[PDB]
Amino acid sequence: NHASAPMTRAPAPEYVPETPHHSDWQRPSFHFEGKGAAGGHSATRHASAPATRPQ
Amino acid sequence: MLNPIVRKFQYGQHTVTLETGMMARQATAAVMVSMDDTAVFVTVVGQKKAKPGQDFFPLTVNYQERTYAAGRIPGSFFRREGRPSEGETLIARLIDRPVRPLFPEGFVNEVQVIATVVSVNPQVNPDIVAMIGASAALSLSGIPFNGPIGAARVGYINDQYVLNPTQDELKESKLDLVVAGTEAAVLMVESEAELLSEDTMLGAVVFGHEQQQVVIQAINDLVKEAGKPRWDWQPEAVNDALNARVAALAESRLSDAYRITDKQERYAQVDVIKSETIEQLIAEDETLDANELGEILHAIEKNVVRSRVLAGEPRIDGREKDMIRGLDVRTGVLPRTHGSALFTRGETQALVTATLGTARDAQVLDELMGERTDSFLFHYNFPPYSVGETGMVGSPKRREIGHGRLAKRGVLAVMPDMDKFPYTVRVVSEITESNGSSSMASVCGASLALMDAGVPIKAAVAGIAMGLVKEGDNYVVLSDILGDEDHLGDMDFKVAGSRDGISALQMDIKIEGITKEIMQVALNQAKGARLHILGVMEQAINAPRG
Amino acid sequence: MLNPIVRKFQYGQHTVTLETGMMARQATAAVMVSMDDTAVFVTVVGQKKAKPGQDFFPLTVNYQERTYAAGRIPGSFFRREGRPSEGETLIARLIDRPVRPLFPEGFVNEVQVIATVVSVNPQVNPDIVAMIGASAALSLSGIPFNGPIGAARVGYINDQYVLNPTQDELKESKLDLVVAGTEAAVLMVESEAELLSEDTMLGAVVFGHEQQQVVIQAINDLVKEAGKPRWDWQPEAVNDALNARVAALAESRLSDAYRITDKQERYAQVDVIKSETIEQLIAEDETLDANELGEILHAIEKNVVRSRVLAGEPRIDGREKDMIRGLDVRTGVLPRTHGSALFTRGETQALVTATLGTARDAQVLDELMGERTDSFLFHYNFPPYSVGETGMVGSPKRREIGHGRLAKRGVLAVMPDMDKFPYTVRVVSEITESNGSSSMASVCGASLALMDAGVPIKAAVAGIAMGLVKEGDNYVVLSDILGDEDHLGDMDFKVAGSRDGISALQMDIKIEGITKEIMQVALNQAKGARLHILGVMEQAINAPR
Amino acid sequence: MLNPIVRKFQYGQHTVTLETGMMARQATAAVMVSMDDTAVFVTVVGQKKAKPGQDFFPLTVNYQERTYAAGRIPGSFFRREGRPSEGETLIARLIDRPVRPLFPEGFVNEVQVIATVVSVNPQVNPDIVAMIGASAALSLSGIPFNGPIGAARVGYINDQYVLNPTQDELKESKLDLVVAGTEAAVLMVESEAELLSEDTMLGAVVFGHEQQQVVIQAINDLVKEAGKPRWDWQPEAVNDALNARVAALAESRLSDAYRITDKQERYAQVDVIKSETIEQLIAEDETLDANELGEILHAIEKNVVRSRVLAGEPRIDGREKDMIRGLDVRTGVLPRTHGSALFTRGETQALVTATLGTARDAQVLDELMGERTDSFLFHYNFPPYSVGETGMVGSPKRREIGHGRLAKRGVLAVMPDMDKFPYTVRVVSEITESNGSSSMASVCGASLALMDAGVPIKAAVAGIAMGLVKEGDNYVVLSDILGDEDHLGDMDFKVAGSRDGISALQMDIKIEGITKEIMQVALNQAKGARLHILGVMEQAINAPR
């Protein structure tokens, strides 16, 4: 239904440091099959010609 | 009772009717053109007074296809014609290209041409009717239009030229050329061919120019009987004394700036010559605004370049008239795309990709002339950083749409038939650098990416953008025109094709005097340029990937 | 010829390749970044001259996704990628948040960063790759930019932090946190969690900042070998004269005007000081632009407010650092909606509705990672009248996308599983008033409306927007920050969650020196604020209707 | 901490609730109006300072419909409502038309009204609720506004008037009329009838106006209790001296120039008189600006035309009050359309086409009230060249959507029933010339095109737009009003119908004193004009093809 509250100071609650939970889980390795790289350096076939006057 | 003025004439195998004086009488001119049941209402409104401080001609051409013309209700969710489609934008540029150069220098009044398709005979294409209607309306308006233009579509059936082939004839035709011109000169050529020779394409341009003279004559008669009185427009006064002052001050300096062989140094020196001249002139007389002096210096720089080129001197980048810029071809640049290539020609670069899909991926276009299934898709993106500028991305300007259709036309001639490659192919071009013709680098990159993707194409295709500069009898053909040499294009043409024929030809002539021999010399220099590019392309990849 | 500069480094379980020098050579900088087959081409163009009379920094980040990257043809009617999707706008906002504060103060030249995805590995998300590419392009450009940034996505699987979790691993994960920062400080944290503690969420921010340093070092080596000469840009020197002038004439008056309690009286007197000081100076300074004097005054004012807050004095509304504004909670406010609620915090009010539909009504998104169906929809509307202004309605460009994703991220953790509630839920939030964080009022209203609609949620969630102001080793954490105290946010953070955990955390730091202890104190005061808001919300509705 | 002021009253068979004071407290005013579970939230924001250069009043009305109001998730691809629909733009004009004439003259401060539908009872239409919420929000805001307006929808069932007919009752009703007015005068009428008389259509306006008084009285009580204090807006003083000087210089000359019976010669001499008065005044006083004197001249010209019309002098084109412009009817113009017609009335001309399709081609509209299949589509296109200007092409404004809905309303009464004609019909009208009312030319062209296409329509329909000029006791009813006589229309009304009844009636009164006896004379003249146009039309097509 309905509820309201005035302007109230909500103080920070008492802080208890947390012990970090520990696990021996081993993250499996990532298997990647591919070239891995993009850009010109990865080109499978390349050709060039300087500025020339068509014969 | 409304009195319509109707003029009928025979255009090839069709009858064209021009009707004026009844439909839109509050517009500067209005004409209803019909060719064998395909009708386009074309209107022209020209503002009589130019807005103060206008620098460029503001001409707008809007082409609309109305679904009811085909006796059909629109199939969109709102069942109403929406924003201009690609086809409509392209037909609007096909109309805009021939007419823009025919308004006189200094005409900066606003002109809007609106062509609306109101009836369609499935066999008669509305684009030629719309161009004829725009020519008739512009000539009837009394606006300073420098002459009626005509238009024709030429096909190549049984080794013969045919005028305005119907869609059925066009299915068996090896050529689809649209030529537009005046009584004296060809002004526009947008074409697509199945690897035809240069002589065939030039004969087709001549044939269409010869056959559109009946349209030109009929428009002249209509103007002689129903044309409005001509406009009392005079170009703004040219300051001969100021032009002489600026020339005598900066012309020989800029000439010398250009006679040095370093691009960055030159650019600097040039700017210097300017800043110095403008400061000195405004100090002598503060009345003259800076901007006008800057425009006059820019124009003097353009004339200096033009005269250096015409005199046989090297171009702005040190190249001779027939030299192509440096070429780098790389295929396989992207890891997870079916096919990819990077094509660099000097300072113009394109990253082109090819993707293979299934028959469900073909685009179904419901066009005014019928439903059509497109298994080959071409998309061209021209990002702002291609030119070192900031701007808006995604939004495709109209030229960028026209450049993607020109590249698709260039590549379409070598795509395999559906019984040998029943797959859907999408080719996406990304212009990464642009100092020249990005559409032709898109053609070469599309060919490389299609070969990389394993699509069996008939042959590799490349394109070349050329330009012809003419002063009287003297002319020079320039290969691989630069983006800064756009002012030197009395005739700017773009030829695409393979080692054995032409697949796409676009021409935009703005001057008069270009004979057929001149077109022989220009298309022979473009053949040499394209064959050189094709050799460099073949040295990388020569056959589709297994 | 074309000679590419390629640098490869190991980032966790992936290899990152940075290539520059051969593509888009007419742009200020351009880099192709590839991580395990996911490749993004990022280009930065900066204009060399500033538009005369420019006040704000024009920075645009455009993120584009290409369907050909995934080997697919677009499914739209035109078979072409179109206007930015909501995901593209959100990733571009995640590239803009960490870079904008790293440009020098005064720099107002126009900069556009365009990142285009060109290849995608269904397992590797292109967003961190695009962030690495933006950092590299902005560090190779020479444009005044204060540091290579890194980027990392942390996940939490089997009570362990995992760097850049893959799409398969992000299913069993309890966290999806993105942390970007420089070598010295964290600058941005965007996260979504399944009700985790404040210590698990901060340990994640630390883990990802420590792990992104290899990216920072790689970009610093690439810049050492291929960077463009640094721009010779200098900030316009301050008119120290006009400044100290305006000070002498208005500082003490404003410092006393701010001791006034009544809002209306305070606002009036300030304009009296503002107008009077303007003329009483303009008289001798002949023609001095007004806008300029108004700026100098705003500066003075904001500095008075800062000094007061840092000195321990009441805030501009009379509140103390830990006080939350008045709360009003109503449910069932609309007759024919499945669920509705009105949430009011001070002067920020949100009208939130929840609608139930069939599995069919669920949104099908075709994404680069793969086709995906979303059964929970969150739509946020920020109308122009919320701030008492006129404007264009229906344009979700008032940061509605970002604020609607932060609210969705706040409510997703408590949403029921599909095998308990196999219905499509659409939550629409209307921001009726705004003078604070509306994104967090939307989280509390979404929780109330979902309980009203009968949706069985795991727990009620609420959110609070906080801020931290620091001057040296002195700092104050302010709860329920108002829209006026935006300038007081050296660290502006927003934390949503339930009574037993955080469900979303957004942080945007603009300064340096915020350690882990400071963030712990800041997020402990944000716990006290949520638990108060949550107790007020539970007094209205405790269980779904 | 929040307390809303709620007032309930009985409006016919419904209970209307007005709620203010709780939601959207940063807007100038906000009201939630509920009519039997149909709730619309309406907000108004007015800027308290006028822009420095402002000639027109910047009023914007935005009406948005939210799908959650009907308990449904939107069927759009993005599961959001993004673009305003046609019905939304037409409800915004129904709200805009009655209120714009009620803001004081010279008031040019920007005002935005936003009406959002937040709950829908499928049987109570949200448009009347939106109009009542806009009247309440504008009367509570304090913004200079003249009186609360009310609204009512009347229907004709069993030869009796029904107030606010429900969606079911509207199936059996022969009328659908919306009347909005103040306490003393009707201001807006929009209606669609099934070929009813003029007495039956004026009785409904009088009934709806007498029934809306409970709404105006409840809004007045709500404003009395919760209204904000009226603004201190004073109209800018008129330059009485400059006025009288321009009047002495040019009034006689223009009054004599207008007795010329040639359009071009009169226009040239008027331009001369204007230029000369301007030049001379500028020579006398160098401070005078051109646009102010030009506007004073234009106002003097309008007053001259009004005085000539009210004295019985011929109109600006030589016609008397009861003469209709020359008519030209042409059928079968387009070669391949199913039906086509060109209709010309003087300088207004419309090319209309009709296309027949199958049942499947009918438009499906997913609306808040419920899904609706429309087998009759009417599309209206007003190109820039119709008035001889250049502009954007392809984008319909808010008028080109209301002018098309008015023409659809005028043609809808004669459309054949589904059993007799089981086809989908689309009528597209292109306005080729505009010097008057293009909507009524669209009505006549739609009728001629429908007969040309073979659609078995019940009877031929035609429309006439007319105006009424009033000065005290003296009034003149002008038939076939021109596009340059718009200033002369104290009451502007467009009547469409057949030879035996009215199919649509739109009125827009901007003065007070228009009693039903003056409306009977106006509608009788409109009937005579429409029968003349229908006689001319019948001499061509005569019957369906």
Side-chain angles (χ1 to χ4, degrees), chain C residues 178-202:
Chain C
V178 171
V179 42
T182 44
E183 203 180 319
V186 173
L187 309 162
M188 187 225 44
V189 166
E190 174 79 52
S191 162
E192 52 168 13
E194 286 166 29
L195 308 174
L196 299 176
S197 73
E198 281 85 17
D199 289 3
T200 292
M201 295 283 277
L202 291 184

mmCIF file of all heavy atoms in Angstrom, chain C residues 178-202:
data_model
loop_
_atom_site.group_PDB
_atom_site.id
_atom_site.type_symbol
_atom_site.label_atom_id
_atom_site.label_comp_id
_atom_site.label_asym_id
_atom_site.label_seq_id
_atom_site.Cartn_x
_atom_site.Cartn_y
_atom_site.Cartn_z
ATOM 1 N N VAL C 178 33.490 -4.700 -15.514
ATOM 2 C CA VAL C 178 34.444 -4.085 -16.430
ATOM 3 C C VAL C 178 35.158 -2.980 -15.665
ATOM 4 O O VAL C 178 34.510 -2.054 -15.160
ATOM 5 C CB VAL C 178 33.763 -3.537 -17.693
ATOM 6 C CG1 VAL C 178 34.752 -2.723 -18.510
ATOM 7 C CG2 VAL C 178 33.200 -4.671 -18.523
ATOM 8 N N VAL C 179 36.484 -3.059 -15.560
ATOM 9 C CA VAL C 179 37.313 -2.032 -14.861
ATOM 10 C C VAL C 179 38.298 -1.415 -15.859
ATOM 11 O O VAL C 179 38.992 -2.160 -16.532
ATOM 12 C CB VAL C 179 38.065 -2.593 -13.644
ATOM 13 C CG1 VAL C 179 38.664 -3.962 -13.919
ATOM 14 C CG2 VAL C 179 39.101 -1.626 -13.098
ATOM 15 N N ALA C 180 38.326 -0.100 -15.972
ATOM 16 C CA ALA C 180 39.297 0.599 -16.833
ATOM 17 C C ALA C 180 40.096 1.546 -15.960
ATOM 18 O O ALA C 180 39.526 2.198 -15.102
ATOM 19 C CB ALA C 180 38.599 1.374 -17.895
ATOM 20 N N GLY C 181 41.390 1.608 -16.170
ATOM 21 C CA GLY C 181 42.157 2.577 -15.402
ATOM 22 C C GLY C 181 43.512 2.832 -15.975
ATOM 23 O O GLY C 181 43.895 2.129 -16.899
ATOM 24 N N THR C 182 44.216 3.802 -15.418
ATOM 25 C CA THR C 182 45.575 4.128 -15.846
ATOM 26 C C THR C 182 46.519 3.333 -15.005
ATOM 27 O O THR C 182 46.068 2.445 -14.296
ATOM 28 C CB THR C 182 45.791 5.625 -15.682
ATOM 29 O OG1 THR C 182 45.243 5.981 -14.420
ATOM 30 C CG2 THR C 182 45.099 6.428 -16.765
ATOM 31 N N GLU C 183 47.799 3.628 -15.093
ATOM 32 C CA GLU C 183 48.817 2.914 -14.297
ATOM 33 C C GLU C 183 48.670 3.288 -12.829
ATOM 34 O O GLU C 183 49.084 2.501 -11.969
ATOM 35 C CB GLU C 183 50.196 3.364 -14.746
ATOM 36 C CG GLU C 183 51.291 2.351 -14.439
ATOM 37 C CD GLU C 183 52.664 2.809 -14.885
ATOM 38 O OE1 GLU C 183 52.767 3.388 -15.985
ATOM 39 O OE2 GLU C 183 53.631 2.588 -14.127
ATOM 40 N N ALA C 184 48.074 4.439 -12.554
ATOM 41 C CA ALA C 184 47.974 4.920 -11.167
ATOM 42 C C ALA C 184 46.588 4.685 -10.599
ATOM 43 O O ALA C 184 46.486 4.207 -9.471
ATOM 44 C CB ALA C 184 48.254 6.383 -11.176
ATOM 45 N N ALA C 185 45.557 4.954 -11.375
ATOM 46 C CA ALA C 185 44.218 4.918 -10.782
ATOM 47 C C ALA C 185 43.167 4.187 -11.601
ATOM 48 O O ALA C 185 43.329 4.062 -12.805
ATOM 49 C CB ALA C 185 43.815 6.345 -10.639
ATOM 50 N N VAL C 186 42.109 3.733 -10.933
ATOM 51 C CA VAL C 186 40.947 3.145 -11.636
ATOM 52 C C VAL C 186 40.120 4.354 -12.051
ATOM 53 O O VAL C 186 40.143 5.332 -11.316
ATOM 54 C CB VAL C 186 40.164 2.231 -10.683
ATOM 55 C CG1 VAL C 186 38.866 1.727 -11.292
ATOM 56 C CG2 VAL C 186 41.011 1.078 -10.169
ATOM 57 N N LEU C 187 39.463 4.305 -13.192
ATOM 58 C CA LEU C 187 38.736 5.495 -13.664
ATOM 59 C C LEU C 187 37.277 5.114 -13.854
ATOM 60 O O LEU C 187 36.432 5.973 -13.685
ATOM 61 C CB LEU C 187 39.356 6.016 -14.957
ATOM 62 C CG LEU C 187 40.867 6.244 -14.959
ATOM 63 C CD1 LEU C 187 41.321 6.325 -16.392
ATOM 64 C CD2 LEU C 187 41.207 7.518 -14.223
ATOM 65 N N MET C 188 37.006 3.864 -14.185
ATOM 66 C CA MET C 188 35.621 3.450 -14.464
ATOM 67 C C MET C 188 35.409 2.022 -13.999
ATOM 68 O O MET C 188 36.325 1.238 -14.167
ATOM 69 C CB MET C 188 35.350 3.477 -15.963
ATOM 70 C CG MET C 188 33.920 3.231 -16.348
ATOM 71 S SD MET C 188 33.775 2.083 -17.726
ATOM 72 C CE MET C 188 34.935 0.773 -17.327
ATOM 73 N N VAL C 189 34.261 1.735 -13.400
ATOM 74 C CA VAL C 189 33.872 0.355 -13.020
ATOM 75 C C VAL C 189 32.402 0.222 -13.413
ATOM 76 O O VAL C 189 31.629 1.035 -12.961
ATOM 77 C CB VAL C 189 34.079 0.018 -11.540
ATOM 78 C CG1 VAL C 189 33.370 -1.266 -11.147
ATOM 79 C CG2 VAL C 189 35.547 -0.015 -11.157
ATOM 80 N N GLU C 190 32.055 -0.681 -14.313
ATOM 81 C CA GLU C 190 30.669 -0.986 -14.661
ATOM 82 C C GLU C 190 30.448 -2.459 -14.363
ATOM 83 O O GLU C 190 31.074 -3.310 -14.996
ATOM 84 C CB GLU C 190 30.385 -0.676 -16.132
ATOM 85 C CG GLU C 190 29.005 -1.092 -16.606
ATOM 86 C CD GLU C 190 27.930 -0.108 -16.187
ATOM 87 O OE1 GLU C 190 28.102 1.101 -16.445
ATOM 88 O OE2 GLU C 190 26.915 -0.540 -15.602
ATOM 89 N N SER C 191 29.552 -2.781 -13.436
ATOM 90 C CA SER C 191 29.458 -4.175 -13.033
ATOM 91 C C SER C 191 28.028 -4.640 -12.825
ATOM 92 O O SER C 191 27.108 -3.846 -12.623
ATOM 93 C CB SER C 191 30.227 -4.421 -11.736
ATOM 94 O OG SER C 191 29.815 -5.636 -11.139
ATOM 95 N N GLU C 192 27.835 -5.950 -12.870
ATOM 96 C CA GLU C 192 26.532 -6.567 -12.531
ATOM 97 C C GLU C 192 26.901 -7.823 -11.744
ATOM 98 O O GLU C 192 27.838 -8.490 -12.145
ATOM 99 C CB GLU C 192 25.622 -6.936 -13.693
ATOM 100 C CG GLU C 192 26.258 -7.790 -14.780
ATOM 101 C CD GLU C 192 25.161 -8.316 -15.684
ATOM 102 O OE1 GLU C 192 24.036 -7.792 -15.574
ATOM 103 O OE2 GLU C 192 25.416 -9.237 -16.484
ATOM 104 N N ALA C 193 26.232 -8.096 -10.640
ATOM 105 C CA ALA C 193 26.627 -9.239 -9.806
ATOM 106 C C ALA C 193 25.401 -9.991 -9.335
ATOM 107 O O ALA C 193 24.300 -9.473 -9.443
ATOM 108 C CB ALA C 193 27.372 -8.740 -8.627
ATOM 109 N N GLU C 194 25.606 -11.181 -8.803
ATOM 110 C CA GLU C 194 24.491 -11.962 -8.234
ATOM 111 C C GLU C 194 24.562 -11.840 -6.718
ATOM 112 O O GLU C 194 24.963 -12.814 -6.077
ATOM 113 C CB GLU C 194 24.580 -13.382 -8.763
ATOM 114 C CG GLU C 194 24.164 -13.476 -10.225
ATOM 115 C CD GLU C 194 24.568 -14.786 -10.864
ATOM 116 O OE1 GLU C 194 24.653 -15.791 -10.130
ATOM 117 O OE2 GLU C 194 24.794 -14.800 -12.091
ATOM 118 N N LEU C 195 24.216 -10.671 -6.195
ATOM 119 C CA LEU C 195 24.187 -10.394 -4.739
ATOM 120 C C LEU C 195 25.488 -10.824 -4.068
ATOM 121 O O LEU C 195 25.437 -11.672 -3.178
ATOM 122 C CB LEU C 195 22.917 -10.999 -4.155
ATOM 123 C CG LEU C 195 21.626 -10.598 -4.869
ATOM 124 C CD1 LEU C 195 20.460 -11.362 -4.292
ATOM 125 C CD2 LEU C 195 21.399 -9.106 -4.767
ATOM 126 N N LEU C 196 26.591 -10.187 -4.452
ATOM 127 C CA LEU C 196 27.917 -10.475 -3.861
ATOM 128 C C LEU C 196 28.222 -9.391 -2.826
ATOM 129 O O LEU C 196 27.535 -8.382 -2.835
ATOM 130 C CB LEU C 196 28.962 -10.518 -4.967
ATOM 131 C CG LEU C 196 28.788 -11.578 -6.054
ATOM 132 C CD1 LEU C 196 29.873 -11.349 -7.080
ATOM 133 C CD2 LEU C 196 28.915 -12.961 -5.462
ATOM 134 N N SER C 197 29.214 -9.594 -1.971
ATOM 135 C CA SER C 197 29.543 -8.639 -0.889
ATOM 136 C C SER C 197 30.275 -7.429 -1.449
ATOM 137 O O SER C 197 30.550 -7.424 -2.639
ATOM 138 C CB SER C 197 30.398 -9.291 0.112
ATOM 139 O OG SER C 197 31.712 -9.479 -0.384
ATOM 140 N N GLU C 198 30.612 -6.472 -0.593
ATOM 141 C CA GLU C 198 31.324 -5.252 -1.018
ATOM 142 C C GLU C 198 32.801 -5.593 -1.161
ATOM 143 O O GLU C 198 33.452 -5.014 -2.028
ATOM 144 C CB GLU C 198 31.106 -4.199 0.059
ATOM 145 C CG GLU C 198 29.750 -3.506 0.007
ATOM 146 C CD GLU C 198 28.606 -4.220 0.704
ATOM 147 O OE1 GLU C 198 28.877 -5.117 1.525
ATOM 148 O OE2 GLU C 198 27.439 -3.881 0.421
ATOM 149 N N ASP C 199 33.286 -6.537 -0.366
ATOM 150 C CA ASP C 199 34.706 -6.955 -0.411
ATOM 151 C C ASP C 199 34.984 -7.808 -1.640
ATOM 152 O O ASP C 199 36.089 -7.702 -2.156
ATOM 153 C CB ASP C 199 35.072 -7.705 0.850
ATOM 154 C CG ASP C 199 35.155 -6.844 2.100
ATOM 155 O OD1 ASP C 199 34.870 -5.634 1.995
ATOM 156 O OD2 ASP C 199 35.508 -7.389 3.163
ATOM 157 N N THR C 200 34.026 -8.613 -2.083
ATOM 158 C CA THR C 200 34.210 -9.398 -3.311
ATOM 159 C C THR C 200 34.203 -8.449 -4.467
ATOM 160 O O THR C 200 34.971 -8.662 -5.392
ATOM 161 C CB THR C 200 33.136 -10.471 -3.444
ATOM 162 O OG1 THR C 200 33.423 -11.391 -2.402
ATOM 163 C CG2 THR C 200 33.163 -11.183 -4.783
ATOM 164 N N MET C 201 33.406 -7.403 -4.403
ATOM 165 C CA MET C 201 33.282 -6.493 -5.561
ATOM 166 C C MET C 201 34.511 -5.590 -5.653
ATOM 167 O O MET C 201 34.876 -5.253 -6.766
ATOM 168 C CB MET C 201 32.006 -5.651 -5.472
ATOM 169 C CG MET C 201 30.722 -6.432 -5.553
ATOM 170 S SD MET C 201 30.358 -6.913 -7.248
ATOM 171 C CE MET C 201 29.583 -5.430 -7.897
ATOM 172 N N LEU C 202 35.110 -5.213 -4.530
ATOM 173 C CA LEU C 202 36.310 -4.344 -4.532
ATOM 174 C C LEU C 202 37.536 -5.188 -4.878
ATOM 175 O O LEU C 202 38.347 -4.710 -5.654
ATOM 176 C CB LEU C 202 36.456 -3.602 -3.211
ATOM 177 C CG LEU C 202 35.402 -2.532 -2.925
ATOM 178 C CD1 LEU C 202 35.751 -1.826 -1.638
ATOM 179 C CD2 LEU C 202 35.285 -1.545 -4.069
#
